[PDB]
Design a protein around this ligand. Structure first.
Ligand SMILES: *[C@@H]1O[C@H](CO)[C@@H](O[C@@H]2O[C@H](CO)[C@@H](O[C@@H]3O[C@H](CO[C@H]4O[C@H](CO)[C@@H](O)[C@H](O[C@H]5O[C@H](CO)[C@@H](O)[C@H](O)[C@@H]5O)[C@@H]4O)[C@@H](O)[C@H](O[C@H]4O[C@H](CO)[C@@H](O)[C@H](O)[C@@H]4O[C@H]4O[C@H](CO)[C@@H](O)[C@H](O)[C@@H]4O[C@H]4O[C@H](CO)[C@@H](O)[C@H](O)[C@@H]4O)[C@@H]3O)[C@H](O)[C@H]2NC(C)=O)[C@H](O)[C@H]1NC(C)=O
Ligand SMILES: *[C@@H]1O[C@H](CO)[C@@H](O[C@@H]2O[C@H](CO)[C@@H](O[C@@H]3O[C@H](CO)[C@@H](O)[C@H](O)[C@@H]3O)[C@H](O)[C@H]2NC(C)=O)[C@H](O)[C@H]1NC(C)=O
Ligand SMILES: *[C@@H]1O[C@H](CO)[C@@H](O[C@@H]2O[C@H](CO)[C@@H](O)[C@H](O)[C@H]2NC(C)=O)[C@H](O)[C@H]1NC(C)=O
Ligand SMILES: *[C@@H]1O[C@H](CO)[C@@H](O[C@@H]2O[C@H](CO)[C@@H](O)[C@H](O)[C@H]2NC(C)=O)[C@H](O)[C@H]1NC(C)=O
Ligand SMILES: *[C@@H]1O[C@H](CO)[C@@H](O[C@@H]2O[C@H](CO)[C@@H](O)[C@H](O)[C@H]2NC(C)=O)[C@H](O)[C@H]1NC(C)=O
Ligand SMILES: *[C@@H]1O[C@H](CO)[C@@H](O[C@@H]2O[C@H](CO)[C@@H](O)[C@H](O)[C@H]2NC(C)=O)[C@H](O)[C@H]1NC(C)=O
Ligand SMILES: *[C@@H]1O[C@H](CO)[C@@H](O[C@@H]2O[C@H](CO)[C@@H](O)[C@H](O)[C@H]2NC(C)=O)[C@H](O)[C@H]1NC(C)=O
Ligand SMILES: *[C@@H]1O[C@H](CO)[C@@H](O[C@@H]2O[C@H](CO)[C@@H](O)[C@H](O)[C@H]2NC(C)=O)[C@H](O)[C@H]1NC(C)=O
Ligand SMILES: *[C@@H]1O[C@H](CO)[C@@H](O[C@@H]2O[C@H](CO)[C@@H](O)[C@H](O)[C@H]2NC(C)=O)[C@H](O)[C@H]1NC(C)=O
Ligand SMILES: *[C@@H]1O[C@H](CO)[C@@H](O[C@@H]2O[C@H](CO)[C@@H](O)[C@H](O)[C@H]2NC(C)=O)[C@H](O)[C@H]1NC(C)=O
Ligand SMILES: *[C@@H]1O[C@H](CO)[C@@H](O[C@@H]2O[C@H](CO)[C@@H](O)[C@H](O)[C@H]2NC(C)=O)[C@H](O)[C@H]1NC(C)=O
Ligand SMILES: *[C@@H]1O[C@H](CO)[C@@H](O[C@@H]2O[C@H](CO)[C@@H](O)[C@H](O)[C@H]2NC(C)=O)[C@H](O)[C@H]1NC(C)=O
Ligand SMILES: *[C@@H]1O[C@H](CO)[C@@H](O)[C@H](O)[C@H]1NC(C)=O
Ligand SMILES: *[C@@H]1O[C@H](CO)[C@@H](O)[C@H](O)[C@H]1NC(C)=O
Ligand SMILES: *[C@@H]1O[C@H](CO)[C@@H](O)[C@H](O)[C@H]1NC(C)=O
Ligand SMILES: *[C@@H]1O[C@H](CO)[C@@H](O)[C@H](O)[C@H]1NC(C)=O
Ligand SMILES: *[C@@H]1O[C@H](CO)[C@@H](O)[C@H](O)[C@H]1NC(C)=O
Ligand SMILES: *[C@@H]1O[C@H](CO)[C@@H](O)[C@H](O)[C@H]1NC(C)=O
Ligand SMILES: *[C@@H]1O[C@H](CO)[C@@H](O)[C@H](O)[C@H]1NC(C)=O
Ligand SMILES: *[C@@H]1O[C@H](CO)[C@@H](O)[C@H](O)[C@H]1NC(C)=O
Ligand SMILES: *[C@@H]1O[C@H](CO)[C@@H](O)[C@H](O)[C@H]1NC(C)=O
Ligand SMILES: *[C@@H]1O[C@H](CO)[C@@H](O)[C@H](O)[C@H]1NC(C)=O
Ligand SMILES: *[C@@H]1O[C@H](CO)[C@@H](O)[C@H](O)[C@H]1NC(C)=O
Ligand SMILES: *[C@@H]1O[C@H](CO)[C@@H](O)[C@H](O)[C@H]1NC(C)=O
Ligand SMILES: *[C@@H]1O[C@H](CO)[C@@H](O)[C@H](O)[C@H]1NC(C)=O
Ligand SMILES: *[C@@H]1O[C@H](CO)[C@@H](O)[C@H](O)[C@H]1NC(C)=O
Ligand SMILES: *[C@@H]1O[C@H](CO)[C@@H](O)[C@H](O)[C@H]1NC(C)=O
Ligand SMILES: *[C@@H]1O[C@H](CO)[C@@H](O)[C@H](O)[C@H]1NC(C)=O
Lengths: 472, 136, 136, 136, 53
């Protein structure tokens, strides 16, 4: 008892929660391809080929979504990368001039390979021949170009149009040599901190976790951007998870995460031709010259029966949080373009796919089976070139035209939902959900939901029986 | 044999023989590499966070050294000075602490008497050393 | 008790009982906080100057540690070694120094041979260890 | 009698007598001074190239300090641990080593065992004082 | 006629204050690094140098 003396330690395994700053760590093989990517640029430190998944079993830590500080740092990182990736590129300020458009006349093919039989792209583009100066500022020349209708608005005086963006900002066009390929990114903490990963399978969004696993840093994170549906995400292993801080509250979104994937198949079957027209001293502009050959609206193909199965599963899962209600889906109820659409960027081109017929259903009691046979679901999708991925924090951007044929497949993981309010007796035991919505952060909170940065405090201290010797 | 941070949930007594694993990874990580391959990569927003990452590594490790330096237990892993422990911070016996209560809980249990103790150690070291000069 | 620099004018002897307070405050400071709220806050003029402060903080502590690291008694407040005086850097006796001369003035008198003092002190520590290696 | 790296080519035996002169210059350097005159003076490439130089100076030096800290040889140019050589790493007799086996190529011969010697030494220090903490 | 480079890219006029006179520079490494200098006279591209200081 009387021989209890302080005994300082060093290297004790004790952590306390805090917030730090991370850094990129790209994959070794996925890097050094002379691609000049936007997100995972050449400045990332090479990753560790042998990450350690050290299993701290016998313990408990309180995780939390909707407050994980890591989302803010990487969101700011994505914004900064997107902003600096446009600084070297050229502006488009000489283009804000009145246009003299005309609806399209051309000697194009008529066979059209009409298997989709949905519709050719008449009235979807406008032949607009504007008039801007050449290198010498004293001379102007007439140049014609093809623009989509989403990039063009009319102020007054019909038969005279203008660019849409010219009353809010100026949109620098993308440099043609940089691509938007989503490279996996491994966020790694500086030495001295650590990242805790909750290894539970059926992990609900918040609350304590009792199977914590520690790693030096996280795995690859896809920087893909989307609006209404998650793309190329990481599927959960246990079962379908419904994530929400307050399901009762309807002021926010609801993240739905699947454990069975669904493949999307969307492509643009028509060629555009790339023709370059100078605008001034050392400044060049890439325009869609004249479409030739195949003419069809870009469409997406999705296995219908897989969609029916996934809808049945998610309805079954939501059947426990709303024990007696009736669940049905409806298309987006309005607003700005992204929410009322499906937005995803592929191969340097932005897509706005309607995807209305994917959310027209009513499930009552699972009494009768929706027995139908395999018919693929085809949905239209416009194409937009003057993009504004963020409201006012990002820089408005103009993707250059891409020639040839665009064909990429995505393979879907997550769905964004939103509850709808109602009364007590007015409701007919029914709750309706509408997809769409959600900011960019809502995409990332579906992936960084397992990690929490911690700081090490190796200064332990505890009584013992020592007594440091005296020097005579 | 354990891994890094691999016994935090274990009892304190059985977790007192794996400290070298944690103490061996305070600086040795991945930040030491400059870049994958060298137009002024030192100003890219990705490249401006290593500076925040690198200086945070040392500035977090030095704080450990400063406290170890003054207490006289510098250059050791498990040291022990000769300042009494009057039990007002924790009056539990020898066995009630070491064998059963885990490390994380113990650190939280006295987290409000630390600042008083951290000042006691240095003063105990200093006045003890004053005896040495006043001894020869 | 005395606070920071609380006895800079006091005598030599009475200023030997306040060393611990100043040693503690050699790295602790408000610069630890990153920012009140984190466009381009990384390269903001209030940010580039703050980073310079953190680097200068560690380099000023490391400078003292490196010299005290080589002198063979790392991890102590006061320390005496085996280098006898030549009695020409300061030809004053004991009581004439520790009673009535002050620290600030004392440094000026001896500041003229320190570059010949730090070097000779280090050699003694090395010399002691060489005799020890061939001893056992 | 030897300057910086003066005896790096000399034999094993006579090289040890100049360890200090190659140790005083691990942090001191030209970087101490500020500049010729203090555009973008703080944002020029040398405004950041110089900053990159300072942070590498402390990090590279202080990394070595980490290994000295664990082994218990802190504050000693020459140390003496208690890890018995088992003759597996290199079985040259003592005469064959310190007579005419020069330094620069010495530890390149042992270069496949650095990753384990730097680990077995840590354990030896740990096992020494765990017996001591239950002996006093 | 017109300027040859006014069309290919952008051209700037250097301010007369800045001077193109090459001032000698001494490159110097941070503390902890040494620079090896071969003082051998007949030293071509590569090959061991036994006179380095
Ligand atoms: C979710 O995950 C899904 C699974 O991975 C993912 O789907 C995959 O998405 C990637 C997207 O990168 C697909 O890879 C691309 O496929 C492109 C197909 O292009 C067709 O059309 C071309 C004509 O434009 C044809 O030439 C081409 O034929 C061959 O092309 C490739 C040769 O290796 C090969 O991939 C093809 O299969 C085929 O063999 C094809 O018919 C392909 O073009 C593209 O290559 C680009 O990227 C490579 C990697 O960086 C570069 O090495 C390559 O050179 C191409 O980059 C060029 O173009 C970029 C702009 O587009 C520039 O930034 C580059 O710097 C480079 O630019 C040079 O060339 C330009 C002309 O092209 C020229 O203008 C420049 O000046 C410069 O000279 C890439 O391989 C993949 O196929 C998809 N998976 C499947 C199964 O289909 C999905 O995308 C994910 N979801 C999301 C949202 O991302
Ligand atoms: C995605 O496709 C659906 C069709 O499957 C589109 O819904 C249809 O949109 C058109 C106009 O865009 C509607 O036409 C008119 O709508 C008014 C609305 O009050 C209606 O009263 C008129 O009688 C007229 O039909 C149409 O009703 C509507 N629904 C159907 C079944 O055709 C939808 O607009 C497409 N997505 C987007 C973003 O446009
Ligand atoms: C888009 O408009 C341009 C002109 O505004 C059309 O180009 C004309 O093509 C005819 C056919 O050979 C020429 O005689 C004219 O001289 C062209 N006008 C020019 C070069 O200014 C173009 O055909 C139109 N394209 C579509 C699809 O309507
Ligand atoms: C590009 O040149 C054409 C040809 O001159 C312009 O068209 C006419 O321009 C004159 C000059 O002011 C106007 O008075 C006419 O009214 C224009 N024609 C029509 C049908 O409106 C054209 O305006 C020039 N481009 C721009 C952007 O002004
Ligand atoms: C904590 O989660 C891990 C998952 O990584 C569990 O480890 C798996 O357990 C299952 C049990 O059937 C094995 O089939 C797997 O091989 C294990 N490893 C992996 C990587 O899946 C672990 O069991 C969980 N903790 C507890 C106490 O059950
Ligand atoms: C993917 O998750 C779904 C649900 O999230 C799983 O469907 C359930 O599977 C369990 C075990 O097979 C059954 O007991 C349930 O009845 C299923 N749910 C429904 C509504 O029928 C599905 O099994 C998971 N897939 C895999 C491969 O494990
Ligand atoms: C994604 O969609 C494209 C077109 O929508 C598919 O390309 C078709 O592939 C089939 C079989 O490979 C061919 O018979 C068609 O002629 C192709 N059409 C076009 C327009 O290319 C592509 O196969 C789809 N991807 C996957 C994985 O099924
Ligand atoms: C869409 O998915 C369904 C199942 O999710 C596929 O149906 C299966 O098809 C395979 C081979 O085609 C059969 O062996 C299974 O018995 C089928 N199962 C069911 C439940 O139908 C369907 O083939 C897919 N559609 C396409 C076009 O591939
Ligand atoms: C896209 O979703 C599909 C759905 O399974 C994934 O396809 C599997 O990917 C793994 C990883 O290489 C393969 O081992 C399987 O063989 C693939 N399935 C088939 C049927 O071949 C795919 O991994 C998903 N995309 C990404 C990027 O993970
Ligand atoms: C988690 O804590 C429990 C609590 O004691 C540990 O249980 C003991 O484990 C040791 C390990 O050999 C056994 O000898 C004891 O018999 C177990 N019971 C008791 C009451 O001590 C368990 O081992 C701990 N797990 C880990 C990984 O440390
Ligand atoms: C390089 O090696 C030569 C070998 O001859 C060294 O010269 C000998 O040095 C030892 C110790 O200094 C003397 O005892 C011998 O008398 C020397 N012999 C000759 C022939 O010079 C030389 O000293 C070595 N280089 C250095 C810097 O020590
Ligand atoms: C800038 O102008 C120069 C000359 O005015 C261009 O150089 C000539 O370009 C023509 C094509 O228009 C070629 O046929 C000649 O061979 C080029 N001259 C030589 C010496 O090769 C140059 O291409 C123009 N550049 C831009 C970007 O407009
Ligand atoms: C373009 O299409 C619209 C809608 O079909 C039509 O009113 C217009 O007349 C067309 N263009 C021309 C030049 O007629
Ligand atoms: C194709 O576009 C033309 C206009 O160019 C239009 O008249 C026609 O209805 C469209 N569809 C088909 C099948 O030709
Ligand atoms: C998360 O889901 C589990 C699963 O049963 C449930 O017990 C718990 O109440 C949920 N936690 C929160 C915070 O919703
Ligand atoms: C699209 O590719 C080229 C590029 O313009 C075009 O000549 C060709 O006719 C188109 N493809 C087909 C199958 O017609
Ligand atoms: C999915 O269900 C809806 C109604 O629940 C039905 O109309 C549709 O045909 C089903 N999908 C397929 C591919 O049959
Ligand atoms: C899908 O079609 C329309 C789209 O608004 C909607 O009124 C309808 O109720 C939905 N369901 C079915 C089965 O048509
Ligand atoms: C699909 O619809 C019904 C229900 O399965 C079936 O009788 C019909 O023959 C199927 N259609 C084809 C083309 O096989
Ligand atoms: C420790 O103190 C608390 C209250 O101060 C008391 O309840 C407890 O019995 C004490 N335990 C011992 C072992 O003295
Ligand atoms: C060990 O601690 C637990 C709570 O941490 C307590 O329930 C138990 O009684 C303790 N046992 C002993 C012997 O101290
Ligand atoms: C330390 O401060 C907390 C904060 O209110 C207080 O609740 C607690 O009683 C104090 N003492 C201990 C031993 O935690
Ligand atoms: C025990 O030590 C603490 C130091 O935190 C002190 O405040 C307290 O007065 C001491 N108790 C006695 C009886 O000296
Ligand atoms: C005093 O120190 C100097 C070096 O500053 C040294 O040369 C001299 O020998 C010393 N005095 C005596 C008596 O040794
Ligand atoms: C000590 O110095 C003071 C002046 O600073 C002087 O008055 C006093 O006489 C000195 N003491 C002795 C013993 O000389
Ligand atoms: C000597 O120690 C090394 C440690 O790396 C080991 O690999 C080797 O087997 C040991 N040899 C003997 C004979 O113990
Ligand atoms: C001593 O080392 C040499 C060379 O490394 C080797 O050939 C010889 O067998 C070794 N002797 C013993 C006894 O291991
Ligand atoms: C070696 O280097 C020195 C450097 O000053 C030079 O003077 C000398 O000529 C060189 N050669 C020899 C053989 O010393």
């Amino acid at each position: 008892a009387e021989n209890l003396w302080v005994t300082v330690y060093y290297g004790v395994p004790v952590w306390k929660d805090a917030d730090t700053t991370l850094f990129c760590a790209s994959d070794a093989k996925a890097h050094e391809t002379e691609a000049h990517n936007i997100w995972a640029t050449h400045a990332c430190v090479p990753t560790d080929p042998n990450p350690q998944e050290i299993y701290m079993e016998n313990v408990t830590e309180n995780f939390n979504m909707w407050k994980n500080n890591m989302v803010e740092q990487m969101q700011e990182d994505i914004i900064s990368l997107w902003d600096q990736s446009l600084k070297p590129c050229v502006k488009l300020t000489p283009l804000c001039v009145t246009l003299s458009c005309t609806n399209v006349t051309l000697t194009n093919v008529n066979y059209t390979n009409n298997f989709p039989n949905i519709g050719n792209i008449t009235d979807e583009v406008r032949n607009c021949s504007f008039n801007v100066t050449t290198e010498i500022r004293d001379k102007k020349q007439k140049v014609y170009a093809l623009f989509y209708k989403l990039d063009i608005v009319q102020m007054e005086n019909k038969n005279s149009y203008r660019l849409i963006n010219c009353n809010t900002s100026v949109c620098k066009q993308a440099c043609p040599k940089i691509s938007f390929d989503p490279i996996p990114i491994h966020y790694c903490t500086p030495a001295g901190y650590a990242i805790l990963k909750c290894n539970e399978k059926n992990f609900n969004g918040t609350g304590p976790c009792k199977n914590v696993s520690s790693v030096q840093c996280t795995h690859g994170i896809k920087p893909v951007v989307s609006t209404q549906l998650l793309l190329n995400g990481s599927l959960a292993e246990g079962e379908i998870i419904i994530r929400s801080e307050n399901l009762t509250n309807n002021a926010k979104t609801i993240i739905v995460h699947l454990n069975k994937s669904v493949e999307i198949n969307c492509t643009r079957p028509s060629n555009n031709t790339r023709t370059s027209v100078t605008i001034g001293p050392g400044q060049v502009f890439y325009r869609t010259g004249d479409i030739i050959g195949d003419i069809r609206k870009a469409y997406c193909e999705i296995n219908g029966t897989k969609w029916n199965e996934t809808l049945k599963q998610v309805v079954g899962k939501l059947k426990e949080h709303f024990p007696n209600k009736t669940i049905s889906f409806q298309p987006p109820s309005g607003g700005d373009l992204e929410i009322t659409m499906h937005h995803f960027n592929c191969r340097g081109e932005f897509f706005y796919c309607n995807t209305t017929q994917l959310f027209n259903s009513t499930w009552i009691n699972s009494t009768t089976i929706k027995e139908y046979n395999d018919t693929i679901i085809y949905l239209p999708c416009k194409i937009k070139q003057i993009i504004n991925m963020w409201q006012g924090v990002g820089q408005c951007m103009y993707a250059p035209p891409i020639r040839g044929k665009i064909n990429c497949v995505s393979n879907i993981t997550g769905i964004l939902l939103t509850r709808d309010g109602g009364d007590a007796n007015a409701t007919n035991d029914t709750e309706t959900f509408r997809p769409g919505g959600g900011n960019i952060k809502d995409n990332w909170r579906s992936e960084l939901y397992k990690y929490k940065v911690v700081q090490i405090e190796p200064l332990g201290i505890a009584p013992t029986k020592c007594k440091r010797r005296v020097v005579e | 044999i354990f891994g890094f941070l691999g016994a935090a949930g274990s009892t304190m007594g059985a977790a007192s023989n794996t400290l070298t694993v944690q103490a061996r990874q305070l600086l040795s990580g991945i930040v030491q590499q400059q870049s994958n391959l060298p137009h002024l990569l030192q100003l890219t927003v990705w490249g401006i966070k290593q500076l925040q990452a690198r200086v945070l590594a040392v500035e977090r490790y030095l704080e450990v050294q400063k406290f170890l330096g003054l207490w006289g237990c510098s250059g050791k892993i498990i040291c022990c000075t000769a300042v009494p422990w009057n039990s007002t911070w924790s009056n539990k016996s020898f066995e009630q602490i070491w064998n059963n209560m885990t490390w994380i809980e113990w650190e939280r249990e006295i987290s409000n008497y630390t600042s008083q103790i951290y000042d006691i150690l240095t003063e105990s070291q200093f006045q003890q050393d004053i005896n040495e000069v006043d001894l020869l």
